[PDB]
């Protein structure tokens, strides 16, 4: 009931899901062979949300893995918990798009996406009660940034009533790994703003900063980044698959977080994250953990939240708690930094509680914040895009595969507009 | 077991196809020798006629 | 319980029958003495009751040198003493001499031997005949034997493996006359006629086998391999068997057009076949390559009518169909309009055998194709031109007039050749 | 299931293909006879048993090198009918090799190429090696490129041309055929890498400490560069790059497709291990103006793009930290319309070392392919040298007598002038 099905495409999305389902399997006590081995009875009563049942008591992932190249999926199948995924859901191409949005969205992806759409519709129809869809993708890769939003569009006209969330990795100017990142980020954002019910921005540079400074570990890795992303993702639905004092689904979050339909790009935070040396130091308490949550330094993004005012905030507390000083601390935080809170929305913080804490931790917080500081990533991406496009640099692939500069101009105008009205309400006064 | 059977059959076929190459390593050496023998016969013909 | 009778007449016919008989004996395991070193042999051999095997072959010649060589060779104890018919005077490349003067006194003994051999068989599939067309005695004796057999037995199938002269390479100077006469004789009397010219095989040996100074033995061995590939289906178990009677059900649309040309694959030196996989696709591409054709003709100059092709080894029917699909997709090969499908396929499990001291090696996959196409009119046209060039001045006509042949015999052969060419032209046009 | 076909034409092309083929065999563990005592599929094909037939073709009209190869220790490795050998050498005449005697060989070459390509199913593209200062090599390479461009069409082709040194030359008529081949390949080659000999001589003298170098050392360095370029297709890495993922990141405009390569580190075993060979110092040595294999000064022009591949146990945060320092450096400046110009690739496999060679092994290596606007100097000096002899129509009769028209040089001169004007127009800021 009210279950959701996983769809991942591209190398980044596949490697995110690889750690996500390892985390969820460890959370539910499922062995890598799909056999339940948990200790608490509750570990199975809503295990159906992310797993389908097969004969023999075995549990199968409801995840569809799709890519234009088979290397990443062939590599992850050999990794831990990789045998869980159904081979039928794996769909791969034989050519590749070469980080080109035009190739990944016009020539190869349109022809290839038929089979993955077939498996998606089959899985969605098989579900008892459809709640929504979740996608994980990176905006720095052209092929992924193409077919991810393409599948978003063609799932959108088909299921207009269901909810959808995307976890988008945008290319930051600090850590750059591809030079055509502005182009494909532009083309991906232009389509994502139109159809994304929810989008959650994630920055690898901010991941690097937090792993450098919070955990104080010498050698960070993509595995640690994936673990953080997976924990954050699971915190979004924690109260959905285990009981809490306040049941608050993704659509609860949608109702309470988005004031106007086009403002659906949010920032994620998780707590606690303590260094091994200071893990035995910290005095795990609700006030300290929530103040650690609202620090600008806990975010996984580059937009300094103290450079703007939060439109709204949402906190998902996880563990066995009571609500009293939770509420009073929410009130204290809203009163103390009232300058950083836009005034025409009184009580602009939602609180929810899930009774079971995370595995390995007695108390945790997942924070989602809609703030007026997010304009910065869009502004820098647009600046790079216009600097690289004013001289028509590397535009020749995009022109040679059926797409023209008029679409680029429309996209640039669209996100310039979007930034305009998204900043507009920051200065609005009652 | 099926993969093992197919791999073993293929591998035996490989050891069998180590073979209409070595044969005319030998045979092509023989053909070059026979062309040289024709040249030697031409030389003998020229010497005897002279 | 199936048998076939082989006829070898002429010097080339005897030299190729000998070559095919070493290969058959080696394949069946029969020692040169005919004994058993230690029941599929029943197709080619017959049991005498205890011990040796008697091949179902007959040899004919009016020149006794080759017969004496065979009777003094290592195979003296194999053949029956009184089935190697040898005359006294050679026809000396004269078709009339062998058709009207001295072949008539020998054809009676030949028919006696043929009926004596046929009385033993109970499931006689048919007759194969080998004869050089560029020789007067061979052509005359073959024509007379076909004439007598067609009335003695009637509907029994006969297949003729004729070795036509090369377009420009020739040994004699009067061979066009007897070639045209024999073709006229056999057109209405041979059910299947395979072209086996020597220049194409020379080029094949030079290119693939890398043989620069060849002899007749290699040519005869290649012909023997082709015959073995054709006849292995009758004596070896296969997933898809084809009989001799199942040939001009599929290869001969009209009774007049019964001349076809053969090819074999992989006809390659034993130097670059281990170092490649010998995939069915590449072997059937090599077989269909125009340069690999065993007859000196260009298939690109005419349409294809039919192709009956046999695989031997561990081939897969799925792979065969996949290769046929690629061949059909290929644009350089086009079939006639009234033939949507023209491929007949046969499958046999027995791999080809290798002769010690030979050129070919042992392989696990082989294919032999027999194609009837409309491009064969070129050899008939050039033979007609060569015949006319000498018939304009009535050159060498007295040598045939003085042997009992009438003057008008050449005119009817010329008219038959013209009618045959017109028939090919009429068949080759689309509807 | 990915394949690439290599073409080697000319004496230098054959001598460098041999060198790259010892290195590939050693890296894949293939014996000189070929017998092994599945990543090889990129460069080799399963010939059934033991050995692996390289996906390479050799062409030459002078049979000495072909006979040497067929009589060397690698006689059993190469197929004989792909080592096409003629009878008469072109004697450094471009017209002889392009109009007179190469036409009877190009048909067999195309037949061999078709036979080799029919086996491949995931053909990535073609690489070609040819000495530009040789008539037969230049003519055959030009003819093969023109034929392949219409035979296959959109298949990628990369040419590793060895341009003559600014002042060091072996022949006296090489500028003519160099300009002719450049004119031919400008509209026919997708990527062209400069590999002049004087820069490699300087590298060997300064770093390898060799006072008497030969062609074998240059060929070994070129082979190492090729292996560094192509290791991504056959070795697992945290960030893979394909052949098709090159001229979205190195070629802004179709006309500008000439670039230069650099490699690091280059040091002998006698003093290699006295220093750590850190990622920062190796990437600084690679960017040093004295460490290119092309004799050009990058300080005389702007940088357009750089795609660099690291092999070893690199850390992406270390890569980003080094790139940040390079960007901070003032002596290296990028063009105005390029905010980010760095592309990074990561591979886990360390470079292999050949016994008896000059280079010592490294657990850390970097190879950069850079396109910059400073390459106009070599074109200008080649144009000046060509004009000096074309003023008096010197050596023109030797080409006129081989079927070549008189006006063929004028259009090549105009194309060179237009290309230089295009570089000048691109190099100015907005
Ligand atoms: N392929 C092939 N053809 C042969 C061979 N021997 C003879 N021929 C052909 O036969 C023609 C001449 O006839 P021969 O076979 O020599 O002798 P014949 O057929 O008995 O006729 P006569 O010469 O009159 O005795 C030549 O033009 C050859 O083309 C052979 O061993 N192999
Ligand atoms: N780097 C390098 N360049 C070479 C080598 N061998 C030849 N060259 C270059 O090739 C040019 C001359 O052409 P060659 O390679 O000797 O021979 P070719 O290309 O086949 O042309 P022809 O001389 O007409 O046969 C010289 O100017 C060299 O710059 C080599 O081993 N290494
Ligand atoms: N956290 C994390 N990020 C990654 C990983 N691999 C790649 N990325 C990011 O993804 C971007 C490149 O994405 P790409 O591989 O081209 O996506 P694709 O084109 O869909 O395959 C880079 O900028 C990286 O920052 C990983 O293992 N972990
Ligand atoms: Mg005779
Ligand atoms: Mg040379």
PDB file of C-alpha atoms in Angstrom, chain C residues 119-311:
ATOM      1  CA  UNK C 119      22.042 -56.967 -62.187  1.00  0.00           C
ATOM      2  CA  UNK C 120      23.798 -57.073 -58.803  1.00  0.00           C
ATOM      3  CA  UNK C 121      22.324 -53.780 -57.586  1.00  0.00           C
ATOM      4  CA  UNK C 122      18.778 -53.586 -56.221  1.00  0.00           C
ATOM      5  CA  UNK C 123      18.481 -49.931 -55.176  1.00  0.00           C
ATOM      6  CA  UNK C 124      20.395 -48.333 -58.053  1.00  0.00           C
ATOM      7  CA  UNK C 125      20.232 -44.559 -57.599  1.00  0.00           C
ATOM      8  CA  UNK C 126      21.741 -43.763 -60.986  1.00  0.00           C
ATOM      9  CA  UNK C 127      24.862 -43.253 -63.054  1.00  0.00           C
ATOM     10  CA  UNK C 128      27.731 -40.781 -62.906  1.00  0.00           C
ATOM     11  CA  UNK C 129      29.966 -40.311 -65.952  1.00  0.00           C
ATOM     12  CA  UNK C 130      33.403 -38.700 -66.303  1.00  0.00           C
ATOM     13  CA  UNK C 131      34.979 -37.818 -69.652  1.00  0.00           C
ATOM     14  CA  UNK C 132      37.183 -35.094 -71.110  1.00  0.00           C
ATOM     15  CA  UNK C 133      35.304 -33.110 -73.746  1.00  0.00           C
ATOM     16  CA  UNK C 134      38.502 -31.983 -75.485  1.00  0.00           C
ATOM     17  CA  UNK C 135      39.293 -35.536 -76.524  1.00  0.00           C
ATOM     18  CA  UNK C 136      37.758 -37.261 -79.506  1.00  0.00           C
ATOM     19  CA  UNK C 137      37.666 -40.793 -78.118  1.00  0.00           C
ATOM     20  CA  UNK C 138      36.293 -39.647 -74.761  1.00  0.00           C
ATOM     21  CA  UNK C 139      33.590 -37.483 -76.310  1.00  0.00           C
ATOM     22  CA  UNK C 140      32.531 -40.116 -78.839  1.00  0.00           C
ATOM     23  CA  UNK C 141      32.432 -42.978 -76.346  1.00  0.00           C
ATOM     24  CA  UNK C 142      30.565 -40.871 -73.786  1.00  0.00           C
ATOM     25  CA  UNK C 143      27.994 -39.765 -76.356  1.00  0.00           C
ATOM     26  CA  UNK C 144      27.479 -43.337 -77.575  1.00  0.00           C
ATOM     27  CA  UNK C 145      27.160 -44.628 -74.004  1.00  0.00           C
ATOM     28  CA  UNK C 146      24.562 -41.970 -73.197  1.00  0.00           C
ATOM     29  CA  UNK C 147      22.655 -42.829 -76.382  1.00  0.00           C
ATOM     30  CA  UNK C 148      22.604 -46.548 -75.566  1.00  0.00           C
ATOM     31  CA  UNK C 149      21.817 -46.126 -71.857  1.00  0.00           C
ATOM     32  CA  UNK C 150      18.944 -43.691 -72.454  1.00  0.00           C
ATOM     33  CA  UNK C 151      17.126 -46.407 -74.427  1.00  0.00           C
ATOM     34  CA  UNK C 152      18.359 -49.374 -72.386  1.00  0.00           C
ATOM     35  CA  UNK C 153      17.228 -48.040 -68.991  1.00  0.00           C
ATOM     36  CA  UNK C 154      15.131 -44.953 -69.739  1.00  0.00           C
ATOM     37  CA  UNK C 155      14.265 -42.836 -66.703  1.00  0.00           C
ATOM     38  CA  UNK C 156      17.415 -43.673 -64.722  1.00  0.00           C
ATOM     39  CA  UNK C 157      19.273 -40.519 -63.717  1.00  0.00           C
ATOM     40  CA  UNK C 158      22.678 -39.748 -65.236  1.00  0.00           C
ATOM     41  CA  UNK C 159      25.078 -36.989 -64.166  1.00  0.00           C
ATOM     42  CA  UNK C 160      27.945 -35.882 -66.395  1.00  0.00           C
ATOM     43  CA  UNK C 161      31.053 -34.175 -65.027  1.00  0.00           C
ATOM     44  CA  UNK C 162      32.371 -32.582 -68.202  1.00  0.00           C
ATOM     45  CA  UNK C 163      35.676 -30.690 -68.221  1.00  0.00           C
ATOM     46  CA  UNK C 164      35.135 -27.922 -70.772  1.00  0.00           C
ATOM     47  CA  UNK C 165      38.122 -26.188 -72.396  1.00  0.00           C
ATOM     48  CA  UNK C 166      39.412 -22.916 -71.008  1.00  0.00           C
ATOM     49  CA  UNK C 167      38.375 -19.656 -72.724  1.00  0.00           C
ATOM     50  CA  UNK C 168      41.929 -19.036 -73.977  1.00  0.00           C
ATOM     51  CA  UNK C 169      44.101 -21.881 -72.633  1.00  0.00           C
ATOM     52  CA  UNK C 170      44.013 -24.922 -74.908  1.00  0.00           C
ATOM     53  CA  UNK C 171      46.139 -28.029 -75.440  1.00  0.00           C
ATOM     54  CA  UNK C 172      44.910 -29.106 -78.890  1.00  0.00           C
ATOM     55  CA  UNK C 173      43.748 -27.081 -81.905  1.00  0.00           C
ATOM     56  CA  UNK C 174      40.635 -29.006 -83.045  1.00  0.00           C
ATOM     57  CA  UNK C 175      38.857 -29.409 -79.681  1.00  0.00           C
ATOM     58  CA  UNK C 176      36.043 -26.862 -80.353  1.00  0.00           C
ATOM     59  CA  UNK C 177      34.572 -29.128 -83.044  1.00  0.00           C
ATOM     60  CA  UNK C 178      34.263 -32.233 -80.882  1.00  0.00           C
ATOM     61  CA  UNK C 179      33.253 -30.145 -77.858  1.00  0.00           C
ATOM     62  CA  UNK C 180      30.310 -28.685 -79.784  1.00  0.00           C
ATOM     63  CA  UNK C 181      29.406 -32.092 -81.233  1.00  0.00           C
ATOM     64  CA  UNK C 182      29.434 -33.749 -77.801  1.00  0.00           C
ATOM     65  CA  UNK C 183      27.423 -30.886 -76.290  1.00  0.00           C
ATOM     66  CA  UNK C 184      24.836 -31.307 -79.054  1.00  0.00           C
ATOM     67  CA  UNK C 185      24.741 -35.049 -78.378  1.00  0.00           C
ATOM     68  CA  UNK C 186      24.370 -34.722 -74.593  1.00  0.00           C
ATOM     69  CA  UNK C 187      21.970 -31.745 -74.493  1.00  0.00           C
ATOM     70  CA  UNK C 188      18.907 -33.962 -75.030  1.00  0.00           C
ATOM     71  CA  UNK C 189      20.352 -36.955 -73.162  1.00  0.00           C
ATOM     72  CA  UNK C 190      22.005 -35.745 -69.917  1.00  0.00           C
ATOM     73  CA  UNK C 191      19.872 -34.852 -66.903  1.00  0.00           C
ATOM     74  CA  UNK C 192      22.667 -32.948 -65.110  1.00  0.00           C
ATOM     75  CA  UNK C 193      25.879 -31.559 -66.614  1.00  0.00           C
ATOM     76  CA  UNK C 194      28.524 -29.925 -64.411  1.00  0.00           C
ATOM     77  CA  UNK C 195      31.131 -27.603 -65.917  1.00  0.00           C
ATOM     78  CA  UNK C 196      34.668 -28.335 -64.715  1.00  0.00           C
ATOM     79  CA  UNK C 197      37.061 -26.132 -66.720  1.00  0.00           C
ATOM     80  CA  UNK C 198      40.758 -26.185 -65.846  1.00  0.00           C
ATOM     81  CA  UNK C 199      41.718 -22.488 -65.928  1.00  0.00           C
ATOM     82  CA  UNK C 200      39.449 -21.628 -62.997  1.00  0.00           C
ATOM     83  CA  UNK C 201      40.943 -24.437 -60.911  1.00  0.00           C
ATOM     84  CA  UNK C 202      44.437 -23.253 -61.896  1.00  0.00           C
ATOM     85  CA  UNK C 203      43.593 -19.751 -60.668  1.00  0.00           C
ATOM     86  CA  UNK C 204      42.082 -21.177 -57.472  1.00  0.00           C
ATOM     87  CA  UNK C 205      45.214 -23.212 -56.744  1.00  0.00           C
ATOM     88  CA  UNK C 206      47.433 -20.207 -57.478  1.00  0.00           C
ATOM     89  CA  UNK C 207      45.450 -17.849 -55.243  1.00  0.00           C
ATOM     90  CA  UNK C 208      44.214 -19.930 -52.288  1.00  0.00           C
ATOM     91  CA  UNK C 209      46.432 -23.036 -52.287  1.00  0.00           C
ATOM     92  CA  UNK C 210      49.396 -20.826 -53.319  1.00  0.00           C
ATOM     93  CA  UNK C 211      50.321 -23.413 -55.970  1.00  0.00           C
ATOM     94  CA  UNK C 212      52.368 -21.765 -58.717  1.00  0.00           C
ATOM     95  CA  UNK C 213      53.419 -24.794 -60.824  1.00  0.00           C
ATOM     96  CA  UNK C 214      50.463 -27.191 -60.630  1.00  0.00           C
ATOM     97  CA  UNK C 215      49.820 -30.569 -62.226  1.00  0.00           C
ATOM     98  CA  UNK C 216      46.726 -32.607 -63.061  1.00  0.00           C
ATOM     99  CA  UNK C 217      46.861 -34.521 -59.763  1.00  0.00           C
ATOM    100  CA  UNK C 218      45.800 -31.513 -57.677  1.00  0.00           C
ATOM    101  CA  UNK C 219      42.913 -30.796 -60.055  1.00  0.00           C
ATOM    102  CA  UNK C 220      41.758 -34.413 -59.859  1.00  0.00           C
ATOM    103  CA  UNK C 221      42.013 -34.364 -56.051  1.00  0.00           C
ATOM    104  CA  UNK C 222      39.858 -31.224 -55.895  1.00  0.00           C
ATOM    105  CA  UNK C 223      37.306 -32.842 -58.217  1.00  0.00           C
ATOM    106  CA  UNK C 224      37.365 -35.946 -56.006  1.00  0.00           C
ATOM    107  CA  UNK C 225      36.707 -33.811 -52.925  1.00  0.00           C
ATOM    108  CA  UNK C 226      33.767 -32.177 -54.714  1.00  0.00           C
ATOM    109  CA  UNK C 227      32.346 -35.592 -55.654  1.00  0.00           C
ATOM    110  CA  UNK C 228      32.771 -36.863 -52.088  1.00  0.00           C
ATOM    111  CA  UNK C 229      30.997 -33.788 -50.718  1.00  0.00           C
ATOM    112  CA  UNK C 230      28.155 -34.347 -53.188  1.00  0.00           C
ATOM    113  CA  UNK C 231      27.805 -38.071 -52.423  1.00  0.00           C
ATOM    114  CA  UNK C 232      28.442 -38.105 -48.655  1.00  0.00           C
ATOM    115  CA  UNK C 233      24.731 -37.577 -47.963  1.00  0.00           C
ATOM    116  CA  UNK C 234      23.837 -40.997 -49.403  1.00  0.00           C
ATOM    117  CA  UNK C 235      26.230 -42.909 -47.116  1.00  0.00           C
ATOM    118  CA  UNK C 236      26.431 -40.726 -43.990  1.00  0.00           C
ATOM    119  CA  UNK C 237      23.774 -39.769 -41.465  1.00  0.00           C
ATOM    120  CA  UNK C 238      22.765 -36.117 -41.464  1.00  0.00           C
ATOM    121  CA  UNK C 239      20.113 -33.853 -39.998  1.00  0.00           C
ATOM    122  CA  UNK C 240      18.830 -33.031 -43.523  1.00  0.00           C
ATOM    123  CA  UNK C 241      19.541 -35.630 -46.209  1.00  0.00           C
ATOM    124  CA  UNK C 242      19.434 -35.065 -49.973  1.00  0.00           C
ATOM    125  CA  UNK C 243      19.310 -37.827 -52.595  1.00  0.00           C
ATOM    126  CA  UNK C 244      20.535 -37.876 -56.188  1.00  0.00           C
ATOM    127  CA  UNK C 245      16.938 -37.845 -57.434  1.00  0.00           C
ATOM    128  CA  UNK C 246      16.502 -34.650 -55.369  1.00  0.00           C
ATOM    129  CA  UNK C 247      18.657 -32.552 -57.713  1.00  0.00           C
ATOM    130  CA  UNK C 248      16.660 -31.348 -60.706  1.00  0.00           C
ATOM    131  CA  UNK C 249      13.580 -31.007 -58.544  1.00  0.00           C
ATOM    132  CA  UNK C 250      15.323 -27.857 -57.311  1.00  0.00           C
ATOM    133  CA  UNK C 251      18.119 -26.962 -59.746  1.00  0.00           C
ATOM    134  CA  UNK C 252      16.522 -27.407 -63.197  1.00  0.00           C
ATOM    135  CA  UNK C 253      13.418 -25.274 -63.902  1.00  0.00           C
ATOM    136  CA  UNK C 254      13.248 -26.410 -67.547  1.00  0.00           C
ATOM    137  CA  UNK C 255      14.520 -29.646 -69.127  1.00  0.00           C
ATOM    138  CA  UNK C 256      16.728 -27.885 -71.692  1.00  0.00           C
ATOM    139  CA  UNK C 257      18.660 -25.901 -69.054  1.00  0.00           C
ATOM    140  CA  UNK C 258      20.564 -28.633 -67.205  1.00  0.00           C
ATOM    141  CA  UNK C 259      24.123 -27.217 -67.239  1.00  0.00           C
ATOM    142  CA  UNK C 260      25.371 -25.955 -63.879  1.00  0.00           C
ATOM    143  CA  UNK C 261      28.632 -24.964 -62.220  1.00  0.00           C
ATOM    144  CA  UNK C 262      30.108 -25.923 -58.863  1.00  0.00           C
ATOM    145  CA  UNK C 263      32.155 -24.377 -56.078  1.00  0.00           C
ATOM    146  CA  UNK C 264      33.684 -25.615 -52.834  1.00  0.00           C
ATOM    147  CA  UNK C 265      34.706 -24.004 -49.553  1.00  0.00           C
ATOM    148  CA  UNK C 266      36.909 -23.580 -47.768  1.00  0.00           C
ATOM    149  CA  UNK C 267      39.191 -24.075 -50.770  1.00  0.00           C
ATOM    150  CA  UNK C 268      42.166 -22.467 -49.046  1.00  0.00           C
ATOM    151  CA  UNK C 269      45.731 -23.436 -48.321  1.00  0.00           C
ATOM    152  CA  UNK C 270      46.204 -25.092 -44.958  1.00  0.00           C
ATOM    153  CA  UNK C 271      48.116 -21.980 -43.859  1.00  0.00           C
ATOM    154  CA  UNK C 272      45.323 -19.650 -42.760  1.00  0.00           C
ATOM    155  CA  UNK C 273      42.495 -21.907 -41.589  1.00  0.00           C
ATOM    156  CA  UNK C 274      43.664 -22.791 -38.108  1.00  0.00           C
ATOM    157  CA  UNK C 275      44.356 -19.080 -37.477  1.00  0.00           C
ATOM    158  CA  UNK C 276      40.687 -18.273 -38.180  1.00  0.00           C
ATOM    159  CA  UNK C 277      37.472 -19.666 -36.731  1.00  0.00           C
ATOM    160  CA  UNK C 278      36.151 -20.995 -40.079  1.00  0.00           C
ATOM    161  CA  UNK C 279      32.742 -19.563 -39.262  1.00  0.00           C
ATOM    162  CA  UNK C 280      29.816 -20.671 -41.404  1.00  0.00           C
ATOM    163  CA  UNK C 281      29.243 -17.076 -42.523  1.00  0.00           C
ATOM    164  CA  UNK C 282      32.773 -16.623 -43.854  1.00  0.00           C
ATOM    165  CA  UNK C 283      32.935 -20.077 -45.453  1.00  0.00           C
ATOM    166  CA  UNK C 284      29.647 -19.489 -47.286  1.00  0.00           C
ATOM    167  CA  UNK C 285      30.891 -16.026 -48.271  1.00  0.00           C
ATOM    168  CA  UNK C 286      34.053 -17.579 -49.716  1.00  0.00           C
ATOM    169  CA  UNK C 287      31.916 -20.150 -51.542  1.00  0.00           C
ATOM    170  CA  UNK C 288      29.705 -17.412 -53.038  1.00  0.00           C
ATOM    171  CA  UNK C 289      32.688 -15.210 -53.947  1.00  0.00           C
ATOM    172  CA  UNK C 290      32.894 -14.962 -57.766  1.00  0.00           C
ATOM    173  CA  UNK C 291      36.682 -15.393 -57.676  1.00  0.00           C
ATOM    174  CA  UNK C 292      36.306 -18.732 -55.843  1.00  0.00           C
ATOM    175  CA  UNK C 293      34.105 -20.262 -58.549  1.00  0.00           C
ATOM    176  CA  UNK C 294      35.432 -23.591 -59.814  1.00  0.00           C
ATOM    177  CA  UNK C 295      34.245 -22.772 -63.360  1.00  0.00           C
ATOM    178  CA  UNK C 296      35.724 -19.846 -65.280  1.00  0.00           C
ATOM    179  CA  UNK C 297      32.571 -17.719 -65.480  1.00  0.00           C
ATOM    180  CA  UNK C 298      31.422 -14.463 -63.915  1.00  0.00           C
ATOM    181  CA  UNK C 299      28.216 -14.863 -61.858  1.00  0.00           C
ATOM    182  CA  UNK C 300      27.921 -11.058 -61.710  1.00  0.00           C
ATOM    183  CA  UNK C 301      27.134 -10.998 -65.455  1.00  0.00           C
ATOM    184  CA  UNK C 302      23.855 -12.906 -65.076  1.00  0.00           C
ATOM    185  CA  UNK C 303      20.988 -13.735 -62.769  1.00  0.00           C
ATOM    186  CA  UNK C 304      20.799 -16.699 -60.405  1.00  0.00           C
ATOM    187  CA  UNK C 305      18.208 -19.421 -60.975  1.00  0.00           C
ATOM    188  CA  UNK C 306      18.946 -22.007 -58.277  1.00  0.00           C
ATOM    189  CA  UNK C 307      21.616 -23.069 -55.778  1.00  0.00           C
ATOM    190  CA  UNK C 308      21.767 -26.443 -54.010  1.00  0.00           C
ATOM    191  CA  UNK C 309      24.435 -26.403 -51.313  1.00  0.00           C
ATOM    192  CA  UNK C 310      25.592 -29.006 -48.801  1.00  0.00           C
ATOM    193  CA  UNK C 311      27.379 -28.605 -45.471  1.00  0.00           C
TER     194      UNK C 311
END
